[PDB]
CSV table of C-alpha atoms and ligand atoms in Angstrom, one decimal:
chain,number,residue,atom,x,y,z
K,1,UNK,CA,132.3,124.0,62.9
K,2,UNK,CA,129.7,122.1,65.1
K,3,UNK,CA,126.6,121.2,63.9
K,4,UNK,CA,123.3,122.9,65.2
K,5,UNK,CA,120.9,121.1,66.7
K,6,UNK,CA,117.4,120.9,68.4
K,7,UNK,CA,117.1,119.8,71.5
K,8,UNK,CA,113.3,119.1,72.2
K,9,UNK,CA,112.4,118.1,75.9
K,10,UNK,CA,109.1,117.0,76.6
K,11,UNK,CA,107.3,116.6,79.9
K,12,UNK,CA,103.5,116.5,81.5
K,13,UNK,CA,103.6,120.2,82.6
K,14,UNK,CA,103.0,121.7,86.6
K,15,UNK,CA,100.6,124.2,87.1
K,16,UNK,CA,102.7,127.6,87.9
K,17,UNK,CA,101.1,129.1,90.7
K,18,UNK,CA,97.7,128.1,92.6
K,19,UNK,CA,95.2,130.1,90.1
K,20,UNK,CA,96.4,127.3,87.4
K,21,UNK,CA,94.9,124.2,89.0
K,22,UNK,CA,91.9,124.9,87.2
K,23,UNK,CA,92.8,125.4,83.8
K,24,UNK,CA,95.9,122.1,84.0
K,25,UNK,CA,93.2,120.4,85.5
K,26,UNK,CA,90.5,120.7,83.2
K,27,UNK,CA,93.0,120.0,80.2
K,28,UNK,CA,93.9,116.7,81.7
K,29,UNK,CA,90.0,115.7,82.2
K,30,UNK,CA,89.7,116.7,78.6
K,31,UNK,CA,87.9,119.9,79.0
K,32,UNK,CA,85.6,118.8,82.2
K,33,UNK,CA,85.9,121.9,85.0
K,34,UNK,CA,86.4,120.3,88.4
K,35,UNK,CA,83.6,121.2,91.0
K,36,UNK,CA,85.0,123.8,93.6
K,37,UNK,CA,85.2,120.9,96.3
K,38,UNK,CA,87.7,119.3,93.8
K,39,UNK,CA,89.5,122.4,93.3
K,40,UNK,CA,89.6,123.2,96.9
K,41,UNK,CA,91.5,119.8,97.9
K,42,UNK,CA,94.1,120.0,95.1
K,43,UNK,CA,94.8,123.3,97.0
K,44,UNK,CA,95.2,121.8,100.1
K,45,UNK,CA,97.3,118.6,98.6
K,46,UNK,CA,99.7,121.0,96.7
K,47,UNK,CA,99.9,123.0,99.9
K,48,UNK,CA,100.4,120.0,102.4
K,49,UNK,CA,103.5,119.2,99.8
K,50,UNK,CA,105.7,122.5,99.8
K,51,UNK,CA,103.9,124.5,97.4
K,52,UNK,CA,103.6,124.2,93.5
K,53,UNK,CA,106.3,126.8,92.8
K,54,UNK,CA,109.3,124.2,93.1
K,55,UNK,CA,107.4,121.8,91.6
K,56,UNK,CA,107.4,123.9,88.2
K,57,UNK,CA,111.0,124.4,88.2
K,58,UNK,CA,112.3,120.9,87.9
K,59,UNK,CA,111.5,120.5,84.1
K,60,UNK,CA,113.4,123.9,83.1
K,61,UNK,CA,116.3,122.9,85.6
K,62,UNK,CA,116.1,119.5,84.2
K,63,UNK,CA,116.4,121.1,80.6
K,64,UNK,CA,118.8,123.8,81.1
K,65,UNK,CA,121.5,121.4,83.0
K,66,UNK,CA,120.6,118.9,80.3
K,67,UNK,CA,121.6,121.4,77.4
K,68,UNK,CA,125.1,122.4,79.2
K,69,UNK,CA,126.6,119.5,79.7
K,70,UNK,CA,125.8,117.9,76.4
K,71,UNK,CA,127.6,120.7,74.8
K,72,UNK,CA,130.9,120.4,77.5
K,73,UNK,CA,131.4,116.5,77.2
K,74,UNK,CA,131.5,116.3,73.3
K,75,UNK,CA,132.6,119.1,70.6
K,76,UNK,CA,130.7,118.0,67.4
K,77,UNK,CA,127.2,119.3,68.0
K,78,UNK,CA,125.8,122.2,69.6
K,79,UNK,CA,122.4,121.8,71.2
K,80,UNK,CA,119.7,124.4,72.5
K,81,UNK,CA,117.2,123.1,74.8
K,82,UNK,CA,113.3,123.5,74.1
K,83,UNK,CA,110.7,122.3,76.5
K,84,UNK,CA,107.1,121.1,75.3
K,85,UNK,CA,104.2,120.0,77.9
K,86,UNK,CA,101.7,118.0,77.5
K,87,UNK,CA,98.5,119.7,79.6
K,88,UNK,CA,99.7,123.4,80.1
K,89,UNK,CA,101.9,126.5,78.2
K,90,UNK,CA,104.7,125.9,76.3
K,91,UNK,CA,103.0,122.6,75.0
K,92,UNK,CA,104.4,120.5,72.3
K,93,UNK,CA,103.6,122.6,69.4
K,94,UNK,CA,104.9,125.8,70.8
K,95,UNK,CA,108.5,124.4,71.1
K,96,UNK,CA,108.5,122.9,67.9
K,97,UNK,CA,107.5,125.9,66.4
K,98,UNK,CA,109.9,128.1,68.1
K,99,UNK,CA,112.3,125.7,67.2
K,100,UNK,CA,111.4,126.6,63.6
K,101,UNK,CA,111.4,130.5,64.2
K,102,UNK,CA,115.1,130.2,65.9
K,103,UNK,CA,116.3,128.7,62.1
K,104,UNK,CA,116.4,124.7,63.6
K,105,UNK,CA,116.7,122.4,60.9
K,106,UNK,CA,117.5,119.0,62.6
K,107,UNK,CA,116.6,118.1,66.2
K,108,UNK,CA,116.1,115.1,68.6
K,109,UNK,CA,113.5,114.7,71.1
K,110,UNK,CA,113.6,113.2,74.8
K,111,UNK,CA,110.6,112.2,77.0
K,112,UNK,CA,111.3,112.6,80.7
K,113,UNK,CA,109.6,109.3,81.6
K,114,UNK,CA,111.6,106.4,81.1
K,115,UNK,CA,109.0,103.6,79.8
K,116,UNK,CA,107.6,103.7,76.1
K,117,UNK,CA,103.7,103.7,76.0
K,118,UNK,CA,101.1,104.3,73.3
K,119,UNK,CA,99.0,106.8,75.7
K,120,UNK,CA,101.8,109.0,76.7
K,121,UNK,CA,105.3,108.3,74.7
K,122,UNK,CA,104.4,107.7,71.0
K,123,UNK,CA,101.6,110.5,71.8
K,124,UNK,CA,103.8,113.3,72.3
K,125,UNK,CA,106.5,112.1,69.4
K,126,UNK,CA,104.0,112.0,67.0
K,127,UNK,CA,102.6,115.7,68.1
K,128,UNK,CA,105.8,117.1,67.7
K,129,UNK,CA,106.6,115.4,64.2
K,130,UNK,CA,103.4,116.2,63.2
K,131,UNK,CA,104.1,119.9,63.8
K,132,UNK,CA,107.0,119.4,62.0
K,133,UNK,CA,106.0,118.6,59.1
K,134,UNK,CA,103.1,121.1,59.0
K,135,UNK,CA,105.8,123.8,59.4
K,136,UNK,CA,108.5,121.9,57.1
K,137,UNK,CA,111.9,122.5,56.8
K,138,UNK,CA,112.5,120.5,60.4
K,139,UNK,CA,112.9,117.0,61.2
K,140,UNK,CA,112.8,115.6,64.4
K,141,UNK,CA,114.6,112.1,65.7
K,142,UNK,CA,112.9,110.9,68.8
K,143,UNK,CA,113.9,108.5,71.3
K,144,UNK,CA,111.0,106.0,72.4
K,145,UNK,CA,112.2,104.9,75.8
K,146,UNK,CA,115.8,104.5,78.0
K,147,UNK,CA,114.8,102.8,81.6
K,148,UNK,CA,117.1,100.6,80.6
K,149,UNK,CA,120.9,102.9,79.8
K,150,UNK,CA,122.9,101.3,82.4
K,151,UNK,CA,123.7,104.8,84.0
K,152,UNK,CA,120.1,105.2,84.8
K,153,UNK,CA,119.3,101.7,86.3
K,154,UNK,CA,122.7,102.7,88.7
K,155,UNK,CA,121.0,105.7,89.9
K,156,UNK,CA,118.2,104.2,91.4
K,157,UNK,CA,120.2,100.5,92.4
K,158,UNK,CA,122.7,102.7,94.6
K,159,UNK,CA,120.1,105.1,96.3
K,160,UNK,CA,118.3,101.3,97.0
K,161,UNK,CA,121.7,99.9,98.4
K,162,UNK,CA,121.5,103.2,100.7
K,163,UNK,CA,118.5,102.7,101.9
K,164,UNK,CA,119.1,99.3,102.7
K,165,UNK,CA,122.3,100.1,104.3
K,166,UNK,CA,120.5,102.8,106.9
K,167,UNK,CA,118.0,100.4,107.8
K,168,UNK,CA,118.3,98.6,111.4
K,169,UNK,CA,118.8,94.8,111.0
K,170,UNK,CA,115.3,93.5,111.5
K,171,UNK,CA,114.6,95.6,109.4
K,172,UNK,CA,116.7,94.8,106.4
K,173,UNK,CA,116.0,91.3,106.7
K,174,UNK,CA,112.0,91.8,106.7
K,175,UNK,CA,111.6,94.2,104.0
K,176,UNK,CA,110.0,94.9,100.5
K,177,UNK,CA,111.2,97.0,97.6
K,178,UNK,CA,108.0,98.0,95.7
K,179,UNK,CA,108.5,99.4,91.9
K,180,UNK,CA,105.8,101.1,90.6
K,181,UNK,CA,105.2,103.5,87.3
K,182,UNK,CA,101.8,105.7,86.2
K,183,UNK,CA,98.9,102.5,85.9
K,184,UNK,CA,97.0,102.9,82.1
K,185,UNK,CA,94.0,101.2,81.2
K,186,UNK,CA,94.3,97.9,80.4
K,187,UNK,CA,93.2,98.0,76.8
K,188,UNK,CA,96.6,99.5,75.7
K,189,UNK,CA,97.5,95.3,76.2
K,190,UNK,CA,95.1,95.1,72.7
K,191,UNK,CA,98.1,96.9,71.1
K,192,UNK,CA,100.7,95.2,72.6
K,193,UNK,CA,102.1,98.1,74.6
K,194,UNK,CA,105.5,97.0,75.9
K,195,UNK,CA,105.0,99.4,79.0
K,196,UNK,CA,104.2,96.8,81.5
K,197,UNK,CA,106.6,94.5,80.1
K,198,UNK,CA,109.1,97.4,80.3
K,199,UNK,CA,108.1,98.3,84.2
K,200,UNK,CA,109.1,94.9,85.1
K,201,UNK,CA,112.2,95.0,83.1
K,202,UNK,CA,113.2,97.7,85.2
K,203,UNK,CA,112.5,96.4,88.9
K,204,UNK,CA,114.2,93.2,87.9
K,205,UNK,CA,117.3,95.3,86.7
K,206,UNK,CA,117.4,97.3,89.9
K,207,UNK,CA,116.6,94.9,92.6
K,208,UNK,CA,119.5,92.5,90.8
K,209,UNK,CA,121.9,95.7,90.9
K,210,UNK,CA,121.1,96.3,94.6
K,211,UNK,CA,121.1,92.9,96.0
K,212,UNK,CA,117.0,92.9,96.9
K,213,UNK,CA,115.9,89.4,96.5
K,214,UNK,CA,112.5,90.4,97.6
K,215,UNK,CA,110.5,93.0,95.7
K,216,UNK,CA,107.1,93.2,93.6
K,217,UNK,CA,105.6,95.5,90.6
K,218,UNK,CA,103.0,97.6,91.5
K,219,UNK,CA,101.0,100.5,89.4
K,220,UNK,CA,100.2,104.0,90.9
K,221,UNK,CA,97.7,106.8,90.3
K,222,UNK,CA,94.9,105.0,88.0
K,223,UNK,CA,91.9,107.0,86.9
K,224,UNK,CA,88.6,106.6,87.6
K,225,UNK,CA,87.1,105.7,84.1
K,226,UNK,CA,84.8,102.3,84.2
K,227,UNK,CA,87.6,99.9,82.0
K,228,UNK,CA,89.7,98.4,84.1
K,229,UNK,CA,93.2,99.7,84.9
K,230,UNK,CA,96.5,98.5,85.3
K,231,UNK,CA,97.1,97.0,89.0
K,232,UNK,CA,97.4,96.0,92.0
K,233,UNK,CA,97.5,99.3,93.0
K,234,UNK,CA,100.8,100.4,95.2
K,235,UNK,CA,97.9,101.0,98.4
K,236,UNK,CA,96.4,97.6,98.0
K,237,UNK,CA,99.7,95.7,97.1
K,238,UNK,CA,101.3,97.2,100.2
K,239,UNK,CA,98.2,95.9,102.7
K,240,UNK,CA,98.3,92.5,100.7
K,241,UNK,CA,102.2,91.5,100.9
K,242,UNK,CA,102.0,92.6,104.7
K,243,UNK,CA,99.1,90.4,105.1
K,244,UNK,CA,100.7,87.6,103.4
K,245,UNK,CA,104.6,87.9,105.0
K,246,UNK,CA,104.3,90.9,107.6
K,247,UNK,CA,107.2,92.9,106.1
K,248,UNK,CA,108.3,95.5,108.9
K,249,UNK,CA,109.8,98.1,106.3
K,250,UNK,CA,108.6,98.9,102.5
K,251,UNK,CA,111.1,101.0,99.9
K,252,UNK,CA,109.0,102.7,97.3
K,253,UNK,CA,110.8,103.2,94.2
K,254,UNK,CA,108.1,104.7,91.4
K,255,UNK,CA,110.4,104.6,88.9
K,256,UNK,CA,108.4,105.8,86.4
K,257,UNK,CA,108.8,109.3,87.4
K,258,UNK,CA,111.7,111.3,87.5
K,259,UNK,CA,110.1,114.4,88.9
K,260,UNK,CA,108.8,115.7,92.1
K,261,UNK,CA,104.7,116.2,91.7
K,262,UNK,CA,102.1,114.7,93.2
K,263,UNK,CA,101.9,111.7,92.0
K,264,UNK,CA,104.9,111.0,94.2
K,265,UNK,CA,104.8,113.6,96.7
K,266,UNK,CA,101.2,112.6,97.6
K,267,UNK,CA,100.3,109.3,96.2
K,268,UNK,CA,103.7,107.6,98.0
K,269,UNK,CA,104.8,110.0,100.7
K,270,UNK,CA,100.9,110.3,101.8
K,271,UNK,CA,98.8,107.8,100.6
K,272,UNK,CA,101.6,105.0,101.1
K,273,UNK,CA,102.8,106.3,103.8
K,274,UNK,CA,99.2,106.1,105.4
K,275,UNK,CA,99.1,102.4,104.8
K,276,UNK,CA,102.5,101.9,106.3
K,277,UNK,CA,101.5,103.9,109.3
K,278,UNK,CA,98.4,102.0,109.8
K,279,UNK,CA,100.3,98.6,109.7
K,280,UNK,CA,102.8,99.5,111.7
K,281,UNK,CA,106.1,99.2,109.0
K,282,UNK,CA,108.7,102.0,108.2
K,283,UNK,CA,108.3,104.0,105.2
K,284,UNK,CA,111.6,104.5,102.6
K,285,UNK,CA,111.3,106.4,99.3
K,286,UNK,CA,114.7,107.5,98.3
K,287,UNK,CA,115.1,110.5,96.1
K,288,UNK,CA,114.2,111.7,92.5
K,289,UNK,CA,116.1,111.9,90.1
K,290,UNK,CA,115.1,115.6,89.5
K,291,UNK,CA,118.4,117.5,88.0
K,292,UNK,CA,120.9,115.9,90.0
K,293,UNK,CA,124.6,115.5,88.0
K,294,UNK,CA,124.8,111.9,87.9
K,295,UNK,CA,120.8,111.8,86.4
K,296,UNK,CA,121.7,114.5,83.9
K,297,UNK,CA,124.9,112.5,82.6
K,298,UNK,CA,122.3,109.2,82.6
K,299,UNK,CA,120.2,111.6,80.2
K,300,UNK,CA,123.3,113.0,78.2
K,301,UNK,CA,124.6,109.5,77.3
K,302,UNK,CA,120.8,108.2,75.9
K,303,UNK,CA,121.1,111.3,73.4
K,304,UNK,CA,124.4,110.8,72.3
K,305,UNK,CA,123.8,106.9,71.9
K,306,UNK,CA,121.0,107.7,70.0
K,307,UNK,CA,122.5,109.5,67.7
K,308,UNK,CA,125.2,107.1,67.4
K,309,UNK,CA,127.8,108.9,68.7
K,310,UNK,CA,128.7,107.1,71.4
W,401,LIG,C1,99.1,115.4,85.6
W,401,LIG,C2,100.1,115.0,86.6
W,401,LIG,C3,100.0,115.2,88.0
W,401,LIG,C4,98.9,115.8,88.8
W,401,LIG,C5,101.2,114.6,88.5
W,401,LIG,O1,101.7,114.6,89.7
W,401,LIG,N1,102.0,114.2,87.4
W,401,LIG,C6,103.2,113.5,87.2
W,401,LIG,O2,104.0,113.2,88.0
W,401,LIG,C7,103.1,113.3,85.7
W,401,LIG,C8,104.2,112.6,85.0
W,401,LIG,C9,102.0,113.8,85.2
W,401,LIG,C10,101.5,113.9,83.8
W,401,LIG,N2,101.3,114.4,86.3
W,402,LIG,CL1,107.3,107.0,69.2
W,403,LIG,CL1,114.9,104.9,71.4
W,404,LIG,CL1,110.8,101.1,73.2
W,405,LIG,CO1,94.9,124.9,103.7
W,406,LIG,CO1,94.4,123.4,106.8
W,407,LIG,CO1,122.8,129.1,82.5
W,408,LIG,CO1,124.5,125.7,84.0
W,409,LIG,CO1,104.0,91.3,87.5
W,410,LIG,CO1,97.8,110.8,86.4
W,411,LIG,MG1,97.8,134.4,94.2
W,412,LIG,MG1,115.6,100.5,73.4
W,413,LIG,MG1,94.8,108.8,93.2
């Protein structure tokens, strides 16, 4: 007789169609409208990108293939799949509370963003524990972070070692791998958030895996609030290393985000790539993780490890 179990997945949220940009965005600036100008470029940005529609799928895809092959590679436990958002419908107390209405007693929750932080991570945990407990009868186990399960760091060290391996030879020997994650203000340091520590952690694991002797951290997509943030900045650090060395070809790997959205969509594959352009160096940014097999085994194994069951 398996045991039933709670699968909560948790994620930032995607607005659904265009007519949502308003209401995600005003959640994430914390109930501030943006002016129509605003509203107008998102528009275009989402546009220029492919449209938001595909964007929204990834999380459900994500959780779906997530769900099916935990229950084919072990027979113990059976798991259903429920996914909670931070900034737009179902958030974080929705699933837990359908997860009570569907008779869940026991669950464990996953963050799709590999680094532990106290702004996003132990946020969202606590939210769902909290909900939790208000409902009763349900407990949650969460994991805190994973960019470091060894199937994950291969994922992005062998899409590096391909990228390499395509480049022409002036190329590969005058290059630089850039890892980047979301920047946070820098007061989360007066807690002693492990996130940077754990962003580093993670380029020097994959740049060791794939050989890369030269890379640097960089932070992406800072806010505009008047403490400082989290940097350099991927733009600046880009212009500043090709100052310094005059690097022909830069590999973005913004390994903080396993997703297509924006924030890599636009603020590598345009805003990077702008910089690039402008100095005259080839742009690389090798794929997403998104639902891809190999990923959603990656994901399988940090469950079942946590656990203990593997
Ligand atoms: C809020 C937001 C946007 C606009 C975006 O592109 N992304 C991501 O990639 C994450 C993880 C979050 C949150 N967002
Ligand atoms: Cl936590
Ligand atoms: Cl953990
Ligand atoms: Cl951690
Ligand atoms: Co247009
Ligand atoms: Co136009
Ligand atoms: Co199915
Ligand atoms: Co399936
Ligand atoms: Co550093
Ligand atoms: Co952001
Ligand atoms: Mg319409
Ligand atoms: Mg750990
Ligand atoms: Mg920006």
């Amino acid at each position: 007789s398996r045991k039933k179990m709670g699968l909560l997945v948790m994620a930032c949220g995607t607005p659904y169609k265009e007519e949502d940009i308003e209401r995600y965005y005003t959640h994430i600036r914390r109930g501030r409208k943006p002016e129509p100008e605003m509203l107008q470029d998102l528009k275009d940005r989402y546009e220029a990108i492919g449209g938001i529609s595909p964007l929204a799928q990834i999380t459900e895809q994500q959780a779906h293939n997530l769900e099916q092959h935990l229950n084919e590679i072990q027979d113990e436990i059976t798991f259903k799949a429920y996914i909670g958002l931070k900034h737009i419908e179902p958030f974080i107390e929705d699933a837990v509370a359908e997860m009570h209405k569907d008779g869940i007693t026991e669950a464990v929750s996953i963050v799709l963003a590999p680094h532990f932080s106290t702004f996003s991570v132990q946020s969202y945990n606590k939210r769902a524990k909290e909900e939790a407990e208000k409902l009763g009868g349900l407990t949650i186990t969460s994991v805190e972070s994973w960019y470091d399960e060894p199937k994950f760091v291969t994922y992005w060290v062998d899409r590096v070692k391909e990228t390499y391996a395509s480049m022409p030879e002036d190329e590969r020997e005058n290059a630089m791998l850039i890892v980047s994650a979301h920047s946070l203000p820098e007061k989360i340091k007066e807690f002693g958030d492990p996130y940077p520590d754990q962003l580093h952690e993670s380029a020097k694991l994959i740049a060791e895996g794939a050989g890369v002797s030269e890379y640097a951290v960089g932070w992406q997509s800072e806010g505009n609030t008047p403490d400082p943030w989290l940097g350099p900045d991927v733009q600046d650090l880009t212009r500043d290393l090709f100052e310094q060395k005059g690097y022909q070809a830069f590999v973005y790997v913004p390994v903080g985000f396993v997703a297509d959205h924006l924030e890599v969509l636009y603020d590598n594959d345009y805003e990077c790539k702008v910089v690039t352009d402008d100095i005259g160096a080839s742009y690389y940014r090798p794929e997403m993780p998104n639902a891809k097999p190999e990923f959603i085994d990656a994901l399988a194994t940090v469950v079942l490890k946590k656990l203990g069951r593997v």
